[PDB]
Design a protein around this ligand. Structure first.
Ligand code: 9TD
Ligand code: 9TD
Ligand code: 9TD
Ligand code: 9TD
Ligand code: K
Ligand code: K
Ligand code: K
Ligand code: K
Lengths: 466, 466, 466, 466
């Protein structure tokens, strides 16, 4: 395990505390054995998500203070429009309040646009893997969310460079089974969050786009963690060895027609989303007509002017190679510390988190009882670190059958906010989990006490299968 | 015309600038003759809205700096929860990124809740007046938006205390005509924005609620400008002459079951919304289930932690009677300056804006050609002041007939942001509009160059009728 | 009286309140009848000074957030050095924590420098007027403070363009009496604070410098309010009718060898000072050696890096003619309001304050009993407005005599912070003082209960003569 | 070497860069081979000082935003007064712009007070060790600075609990040698900066105060690092094993009559100083009379209101034992890493810096040629880390004899700012210095090119002896 020094120094700090063990037990019972329902005051190191918890730079804060809060035609909107043209070479932008707001702008528009001429009677979205919020909007509009990640992602301990790649074989098969007229869009997720933050190769993005161009299929790039994806392409593809991160980003988006990005990830923000469209003005026009009643006027889209300002700066900082090397190198440090101690993880580590394979860790719990959730609750009661589940819990139920969706991966996600915690914080996390090697065989799963029909894991209250 | 001194002093300033005449004409021609499509760099004094353009206090910025950005269980969420219990005596809250996000959470829930028990076969919403964003969500969910403001709101020059009241006769008539089973909810808009920011009396709110309870009808208080309504109740109702503003607010929300608040208005914010529910835990649970995929997790709802922190402080500052007296007095001062010169305005002035009766100002333009928009474009080219139309342009087309909704009033709204402009800015505005007396009879209407199907006035490009 | 609109809008506010008459009476008795010993909570509108109470822009606060706090070689130091070369064409800078710190760096160096040749046996300083802090450091170093302001400054009600000019005849008479070898330096105060913030003409500055170089006398420009002086030169000197404010400034500092500036005035700061030297590198090195033990290291001078960054921005905002026209126009508006009611004031009003001639307002109080202080205490008890006296109280005792220095003027100074109060605040100030027109003849003077030896008026406790 | 995790997380960052080798060699030759003359742009990790470079909390920045910038009676002044009464039990305070301003306020007042009855003909100050600016002010007022640190401070490698203790035998001998009437004050520096940031025991502080009150000698506590001293007392004195830090601080100041403090150290600020007096009102009044000419009015003393607000919060956070444990543990970690590699340091490590004994590192260079400075220049040219010399260079020449004062230690100080750098940054510093283990015999020494008469090390340019 190698530590990479921060390419920055601390300018402002925020106090954290370790709750007593009795506090954590009472807090978990009141939270229905769901860490999502814990208050932040009962959490020490918060690994629930890397979304909106990032630490901003002084230039980001300075940009916020001078932000133009005008309702129509904010100066920061035009700075954002020129920034997207610089990075992605896309000509149209629509700001959104965060990622699921961006999808709520674009996805229904893409469905109605595909439904012209009376086609797409059984519409489907195809992705390497739809994340929970992305798949929810696909199904909330009456479509099927098809995930076709490469099989090499399911072998957790075997190394591969591109565990987030599309399964090109499955892609052509789904196109032949449903027909191009029923395929609303192909959603390229970079990095593939459900597969473990694993990257997608350039040649995979190119081949997927060329196949979609053959059938006249619209391609959207789910761009929450595109900078971390670009870093891996520079690191693992010999073709981009002497290329800048921006040069890699510029080539990635030659293989998409639009993007839906959650600026709360790689752009190093606490709030914010973005829709950008390459050249289809009709799709841009329809998406604007939906942005107004749902998010807000088309030049702020549910964001304060200061947040568009912070986004303009954060989009530049998120692509800085020295930062990406430390950020991804820190996650690699936490994974290597666990891997060297015998904890099975998704190898190699992704861009934003370490994914502990809880299939091998707690095999006595079936997947339908959420074994990864039992490990998370044990980690919290042991250390006050709060993690999140990426397995059968998050996958939810199939909207057609109403039963458990087939989960190939049962993961505990140790999500790392950007520029927030040090490698000494990582050692605390690793040493707390390593200290539970003799208690893994004792854990038992959870059963539902209150289950929401859509995105159940966020607010569900669980009961320990005691 | 009387000037009221600021109960505060200036701590931070932002430069404004007057664009040249040639700049304004070219910018308007570029904007399709729609000021919404103007950039802020081409606007001197921006009177387009009082939403999100407010100036915050030092305490509000201090609250933002220490805001908890935790994804789940933010410390500021619980502060926002205790604040709603303090102000409104409501037990449940759901933050939203702004007002239309709050209505997107609650309104479809209130429809599915009524439908589940075999009611709402032909669903309608009843309000003193639905605003353009509020009515859009009603029509998007397949309902009819019915506006029953008192007739006195149409007698613009004649003073009346409560030009925002429900027409109680029309309320009982619409209940019998449609059936209480088909009325999804009653929406009490305080203040009534479409009627000129005019207040609703306490006795009117009470009688409307009691009527709804006889028929089992849900009552939602559209609460964007609730503090300005509470001031008018204190200033004009003899029953609350010696009551605090908070006491008036506490009594106001005894006559609703839930509220949908755009915190970008009276809570003195640049972004933010809120859903608060009095005691219906079932409606609260369904609303949370919809909030998760549409806005965000239930403890931030598409808002950064700092913005919930500013909301808790702004909710307090917005209730201070000394501030409200200055704010509404500044609107009254601008209206008086125009009224002293013969400009027909909605008298008395509302809480947040001066509404110029362009029906009486430019009679030679029929309402179907947006006469108020002609006055706005003339005022902008003369002085660089951007105003917004509240008439046939904003009312749009009726969804059932596809034809122009009958507009009872053609208003130009001079919307005043809170704690931003001085009374010397007000003098510039008044002098500018007064200087267009000899050119009113020469103005002409506008045609559509591009008309959106939903919320057209935001992005429609216009053509001056030759 | 004419109101001038702000060339900006408000972005942040700070609450002020009016304490009751009861609170003010118990506060003044507690404060030894000296308003300087009053807490700010017992003060409504604070007119004590225009120093450090200004409101900054958003660009200023942004510069602070990205400020380089480095101990040696802060990035903002070199920006501050490049700014002085732009504005003043001076080659050397030394930051100081405020203006009196800048005088403590430079003035002792000039005395020792003059004493090398065996000169300065009876050292004196010559100025149009040393302010209380400038003269104090002169007398701390064993020198006499000689003030030779134009006689027209004592002609209160009679208009004159340049009531801050040097008396050229008295300048030549003092050079011949004491000898050029005994004159350590000439201090050009712009504007002349003790004459009422009145400006010095460019030709007067040019003549004083030509006389000084004729005798080898060092010229220091007291530059606390240099921008307000530059505005008056453009307004009243026809040679600079079509010149920018920066061009006027550039010509002003052709007639000086160095400057001591309190950045808490025209550079729109809450803290900060500056020493700048034209080209004499020996003085720069000698002043650097004293800066280190007294203020701090030579690249921050007892200032935080954020404050140097705000200084670089405020120096630019202080030269904008639109702002100066509004700022000085606001002082002119308050002065005109008092003058239109018969209140004798130093006419025309200066750049930063309105000076009420209390020698004409309250004739029944001898100069040794501080008549203006009686008017201030009366004005504070009436309205809660705090003001400051510029007469025999501030002038102090003659160090060689030990008795009262003769004062030719008895001023009450209504000092206006920059971009803090509106013209409506100005109306409150005037109306309060005008309401005292019947109680002026009944006021009595003040005598000393505790007198400091150095600068008595700041911490002295008084006793009203009954 | 044990790494101690941060009791906080990062909220804001600022970027740091590693310059190239040629840039560092170009910058060092341009800086006159004096790191004090390097621009911060040419510095990677800055170990020059721990003064004013600290990172603030979110609470501290929030306090700045609501700071009262009133000239007289700022609310933050009264908060600072109550804070000093809480922490130190002292009844009087005077804010200063920084530590050397606090000494310029109090030290000349103590000299004239001691000379009140014509005594103190040969005045002296006695301390465990006067730091450079403190001794400079002692000697600027015609006094001798007597340092009597325990001789166990001169044995670098041998551990001792209290290497900052007064040599009690030399204290009593100095009292008899000079007479109590010549001893203006005794200065207890906590921690003792010149001895390596080493602590002073509670028993030592108690005995020095008892001996002083026996002779009627005023005792001033140089309190720049009083929290770090209070931590060591709790850590090493078994008497305070179960006491809080505040209880240790409260007991420390029973053994002084006043304090001078640079708030730029333990109170975690970027600017600020403080004078506090236990109960001597006459000295307080005399100190106020000097603050006004030199620093500013007595309720701000050369500080912006926001900086007094930051000081009230910083004085609280500086006493938090969890933070002090991590802070001092981080310095111990850097020292242990160097000590484990055979590099001599002042053992044990002090509170704020690792002191590398260059007398044992480069015995080839005599102390008169500043051997530690050659090591500093070598470390910077190798890694971009800037350190400071504390040896014969810092000590200076005798203001009497004009030759260099005897230095019993030649240190290279690796000063660590508070909450700014991670333990990974320490590894960079350690590995960089360890990598020079071979070039120590190559080092060269320095000779002056320009020497200031007071505090030479700051601005002196020097020629390499090679
Ligand atoms: C690829 C991709 N696309 C769109 C989005 C949505 O964006 P947004 O609305 O701004 O959150 C995301 C978001 N991911 C999240 C944030 C959040 C979520 O949505 N599910 C989930 C599950 C557990 C914890 C936290 C979350 C994350 O990984 O923690 C995303 O990963
Ligand atoms: C009573 C009420 N309820 C809900 C809302 C919606 O809240 P939100 O999503 O935060 O905007 C509003 C909002 N009003 C607006 C803001 C905005 C809008 O919606 N239409 C419109 C038309 C012209 C200019 C600006 C606007 C305003 O008056 O300028 C409201 O007035
Ligand atoms: C021309 C000039 N030169 C230097 C300086 C000093 O600068 P600094 O150390 O930053 O205060 C000043 C300062 N003037 C002051 C500020 C302050 C002061 O000093 N005396 C005084 C008397 C009454 C009220 C307030 C004050 C002011 O006008 O209110 C100045 O006017
Ligand atoms: C015990 C004690 N008392 C008073 C003070 C002075 O306070 P202030 O005016 O705020 O700096 C200090 C200050 N120490 C410093 C700061 C500065 C200095 O003064 N000399 C020096 C030498 C080398 C580098 C940097 C410095 C420090 O060690 O880095 C102090 O250590
Ligand atoms: K957040
Ligand atoms: K806004
Ligand atoms: K101030
Ligand atoms: K600093």
């Amino acid at each position: 395990a190698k530590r990479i020094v921060e390419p920055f120094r601390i300018k402002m700090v925020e106090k954290i505390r370790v709750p007593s063990r009795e506090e954590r037990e009472a807090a978990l019972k009141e939270a229905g054995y769901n860490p999502f329902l814990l208050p932040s005051s009962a959490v020490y190191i918060d690994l629930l998500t890397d979304s909106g918890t990032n630490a901003m730079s002084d230039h980001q804060w300075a940009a916020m203070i001078t932000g133009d809060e005008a309702y129509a035609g904010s100066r920061n909107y035009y700075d954002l429009k020129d920034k997207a043209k610089e990075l992605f070479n896309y000509d149209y932008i629509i700001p959104a309040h965060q990622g699921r707001g961006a999808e709520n702008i674009l996805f229904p528009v893409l469905l109605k646009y595909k439904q012209k001429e009376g086609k797409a009677k059984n519409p489907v979205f195809i992705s390497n893997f739809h994340f929970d919020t992305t798949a929810a909007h696909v199904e909330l509009n009456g479509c099927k969310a098809i995930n076709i990640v490469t099989e090499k992602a399911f072998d957790s301990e075997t190394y591969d460079d591109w565990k987030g790649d599309f399964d090109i074989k499955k892609l052509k098969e789904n196109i032949a089974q449903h027909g191009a007229d029923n395929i609303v869009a192909i959603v390229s997720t970079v990095t593939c969050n459900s597969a473990g933050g694993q990257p997608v190769s350039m040649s995979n993005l190119k081949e997927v786009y060329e196949i979609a161009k053959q059938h006249g299929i619209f391609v959207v790039m789910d761009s929450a963690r595109f900078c971390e994806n670009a870093y891996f392409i520079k690191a693992r593809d010999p073709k981009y060895k002497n290329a800048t991160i921006k040069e890699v980003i510029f080539d990635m988006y030659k293989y998409a027609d639009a993007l839906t990005m959650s600026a709360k990830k790689d752009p190093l923000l606490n709030i914010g989303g973005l829709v950008a469209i390459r050249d289809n003005e009709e799709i841009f026009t329809l998406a604007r007509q939906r942005c107004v009643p749902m998010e807000g006027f088309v030049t702020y889209g549910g964001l304060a002017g200061r947040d568009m300002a912070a986004m303009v700066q954060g989009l530049e900082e998120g692509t800085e190679e020295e930062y990406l090397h430390y950020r991804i190198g820190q996650v690699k440090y936490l994974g290597d510390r666990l891997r060297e101690a015998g904890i099975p993880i998704q190898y190699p580590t992704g861009g934003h988190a370490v994914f502990v394979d809880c299939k091998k860790l707690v095999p006595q719990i079936p997947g339908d009882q959420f074994p990864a959730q039992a490990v998370i609750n044990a980690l919290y009661l042991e250390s006050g670190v709060r993690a999140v589940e990426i397995g059968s819990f998050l996958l939810g139920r199939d909207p057609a059958t109403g039963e458990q969706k087939h989960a190939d991966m049962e993961f505990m996600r140790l999500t790392i906010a950007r520029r927030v915690y040090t490698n000494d914080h990582m050692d605390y996390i690793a040493d707390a989990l390593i200290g539970l090697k003799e208690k893994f065989a004792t854990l038992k799963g959870l059963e539902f006490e209150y289950e929401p029909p859509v995105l159940r894991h966020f607010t569900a209250r669980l009961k320990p299968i005691e």
